[PDB]
C-alpha cells in the first residue's frame, strides 16, 4: 500500500544478470526527464458487409510487443578515482557500450579506455552487429525492475550556453521485466559521499566553449565564437521481432545500423579576420562536393590552470554549405558530419574527458589522439656545425631541435620549397652542384601532424 514517486528513482547499469559487484554495476545519476517503458501492438478484425442488417462487430488480438524504450540525461562529470588514480567518468560503461562491441577493458586502446591524464572514447572498434550489451536496473522507491539486454542507441549532447554540460542517452531493450526481489544492495553499489564530493568538484559549463575549426585543404584556422550547438553519436540500431500469429512475441536480437557522428553549430557573423563571415563566404564561393575540415569542439574551455573539459575531435569532417540565420543579430549555422577516411576504418572521431586539462594537454590530445602523449610545439632547424651558408658542390647535413623535449614523435621530414639550387634526401644530407647562384630554402615538418614549421634561409653563393 504505497504510491511511487519519480524523484526516488535510481538507475544502475550492468553487464551481468548475476554476480553484481562494483566493477559490473554502478549507479547513473539521472535527472527529471528520465523515462522508460514498453508498448504493445494489436489489431482489430472487422467484418465489412454491404447488405441490409449487416454485422457490426469487431475483435482485438494482441500480436506483438515493441522494443522497450528508455532515456535519461546525465551530467558530464569527469574525475579521478582514488582506487586506480585514472581519470574516469561515472557513466563509463555507457560510453563503452556506445563506442565498441567488445568486452570492456580500460587498460586497452579502443572504445572507452582511461589514463592517468584523461578519459578517452574512440570508435575504432565498433564494427559489430551487436555492441557491448548492458542491463539497465531501475529502482523506484521500494519495487525493482530492469530492462533485459539493452543497447545504447545514441547519446545526445546539447551545447546550450548558460547551462551545464549534459548528455542525453537513448536506447532499446528486449523486454522490461519487473523484479520482486532485490538484485543487489543499492546502498553499497550506489555512489558514496566521498566520490560525490569529488564529482561535484568538477563540472563542465557549456558557456565556456571554444571551438577550433581548420580547413585541411587550405590550412586556415577560424575564430568562431559559438552561440549554441549540438552533436550526436548515433548507431541507428533496429530491433527485430518475430511475427507469430498464435502467440505474442518480444524482440529477439538486434542489428546496428550506420554509425553517424553529426553536429550543428550556430554563431554570429563576424567581420573580423578569419571570422564567421570569412568561413561562410569561403564555403559558398568554393562550392565543393566534399570538404576536409578539422573540428575540435572543446566544452568547458581551455586554460593554463587545470579545468574540467569534454572534447570532441573530428579529424576529417564534412561541413555543409552554411546559411544565414536572420535574427535580431545576424548569424549562421555550421552543420558538420565526421566522416572516416575509409568506410571500414572507423576513426570518425574520438572524445577526451578529464578534470585536469591544461592547454598543452588538449592540444596534444587534438594532434596526437591522447592527452598523455606530448606533441611538438615549435622547431628551429640546425645545420651541421652552426653553418650559415654554402658554396657550390658542398654538402650540408642539417639537424633539428624540437620542443618539448619529451614529445613522442621527435622526427621530421625534409623538403625544398623556395629556389632550385640544392636537393635533400630522407636523412637530410643536402647536396648542391655548380651554377648555383641563388638563395635556396629548406623546410621540415613533424610526422605527428602537429603543424610545426622548421625554416631556414641558407645563402648559397657561387663560391670564392
Amino acid at each position: 500500500m504505497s504510491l511511487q514517486l519519480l524523484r526516488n528513482t535510481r538507475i544502475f547499469v550492468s553487464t551481468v544478470k548475476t554476480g553484481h559487484n562494483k566493477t559490473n554495476t554502478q549507479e547513473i545519476l539521472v535527472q527529471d526527464d528520465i523515462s522508460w517503458g514498453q508498448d504493445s501492438n494489436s489489431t482489430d478484425i472487422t467484418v465489412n458487409e454491404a447488405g441490409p442488417r449487416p454485422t457490426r462487430g469487431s475483435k482485438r488480438f494482441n500480436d506483438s510487443l515493441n522494443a522497450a524504450e528508455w532515456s535519461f540525461s546525465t551530467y558530464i562529470l569527469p574525475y579521478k578515482d582514488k582506487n586506480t588514480s585514472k581519470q574516469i567518468v561515472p557513466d563509463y560503461m555507457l560510453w563503452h557500450a556506445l563506442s565498441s562491441g567488445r568486452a570492456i577493458n580500460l587498460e586497452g586502446t579502443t572504445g572507452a579506455h582511461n589514463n592517468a591524464t584523461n578519459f578517452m572514447v574512440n570508435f575504432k572498434d565498433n564494427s559489430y552487429h551487436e555492441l557491448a550489451m548492458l542491463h539497465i536496473y531501475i529502482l523506484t522507491d521500494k519495487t525493482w525492475s530492469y530492462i533485459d539486454s539493452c543497447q545504447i542507441n545514441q547519446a545526445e549532447v546539447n551545447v546550450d550556453i548558460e547551462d551545464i554540460g549534459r548528455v542525453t542517452w537513448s536506447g532499446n531493450g528486449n523486454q522490461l521485466i519487473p523484479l520482486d526481489e532485490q538484485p543487489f544492495d543499492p546502498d553499497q553499489i550506489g555512489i558514496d559521499d566521498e566520490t560525490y564530493m569529488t564529482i561535484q568538484g568538477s563540472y563542465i559549463k557549456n558557456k565556456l566553449t571554444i571551438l577550433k575549426i581548420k580547413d585541411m585543404d587550405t590550412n586556415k584556422s577560424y575564430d568562431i565564437p559559438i552561440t549554441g550547438g549540438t552533436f550526436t553519436i548515433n548507431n541507428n540500431i533496429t530491433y527485430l521481432t518475430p511475427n507469430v500469429m498464435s502467440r505474442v512475441t518480444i524482440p529477439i536480437g538486434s542489428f546496428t545500423g550506420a554509425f553517424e557522428l553529426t553536429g550543428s553549430l550556430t554563431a554570429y557573423l563576424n567581420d573580423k579576420s578569419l571570422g564567421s563571415m570569412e568561413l561562410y563566404k569561403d564555403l559558398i564561393k568554393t562550392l565543393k562536393v566534399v570538404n576536409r575540415f578539422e573540428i575540435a569542439l572543446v566544452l568547458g574551455g581551455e586554460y593554463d590552470d587545470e579545468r574540467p573539459a569534454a572534447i570532441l575531435v573530428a579529424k576529417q569532417a564534412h561541413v555543409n554549405i552554411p546559411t544565414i540565420e536572420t535574427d535580431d543579430v545576424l548569424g549562421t549555422s555550421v552543420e558538420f558530419k565526421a566522416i572516416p577516411s575509409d568506410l571500414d576504418a572507423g576513426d570518425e572521431g574520438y572524445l577526451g574527458f578529464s578534470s585536469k586539462y591544461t592547454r598543452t594537454t588538449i592540444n596534444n590530445l587534438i594532434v596526437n589522439g591522447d592527452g598523455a602523449t606530448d606533441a611538438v610545439t615549435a622547431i628551429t632547424v640546425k645545420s651541421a656545425g652552426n653553418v650559415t651558408t654554402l658554396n657550390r658542390s658542398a654538402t650540408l647535413q642539417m639537424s633539428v631541435e624540437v620542443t618539448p623535449s619529451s614529445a613522442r614523435n621527435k622526427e621530421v621530414t625534409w623538403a625544398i620549397t623556395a629556389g632550385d639550387a640544392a636537393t635533400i634526401n630522407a636523412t637530410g644530407l643536402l647536396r648542391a652542384d655548380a651554377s648555383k647562384t641563388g638563395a635556396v630554402t629548406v623546410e621540415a615538418t613533424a610526422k605527428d601532424g602537429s603543424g610545426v614549421k622548421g625554416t631556414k634561409v641558407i645563402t648559397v653563393t657561387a663560391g670564392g
Binding site: T413, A415, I424, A426
Partner: protein
Amino acid sequence: MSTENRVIDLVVDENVPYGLLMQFMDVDDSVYPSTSKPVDLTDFSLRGSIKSSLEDGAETVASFTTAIVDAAQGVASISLPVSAVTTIASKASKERDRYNPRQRLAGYYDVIITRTAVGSAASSFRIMEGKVYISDGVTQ
C-alpha cells in the same frame, strides 16, 4: 588500341623467398596472324626499389635483386631473398584488416628496365608499378 596494365600489386610471404619472372615478347598484327618472337635481353638490366610512401623523402624499405634468366627466350626474373622479405615485414604498417589479418601494406614499388651502352641511347622505361603487400607467417 587496348589498355595496358602497368599497375600490378605484389603479395609476398613472410619467411619465404619471393620470386617473380617477366617475359618480354615482341608482337605484331599483320596479314599473317599474330607473330611473337622473344625479345633478346642483351645489355638489358632491371632495378627496383620499395618505399613506404609515394611522397618525396620516403624511407626506403628495401630494394629488389635483379637477374636475367634466358636472353634467347626473353625471360627476366625480379625477386628478393628471404632476409629482404623479413626486412620489409619489419617495416610494414602495423594496421591489420579484418577477414584476413595476414595482409599488411608494405609500400610502393617500381621497376625500370634500361639499356646502357656507348652506342645505346640513354633510355629508361618504367615497366610496372604498384603496391607491395605482406602475408605474415608464424613459422620461422
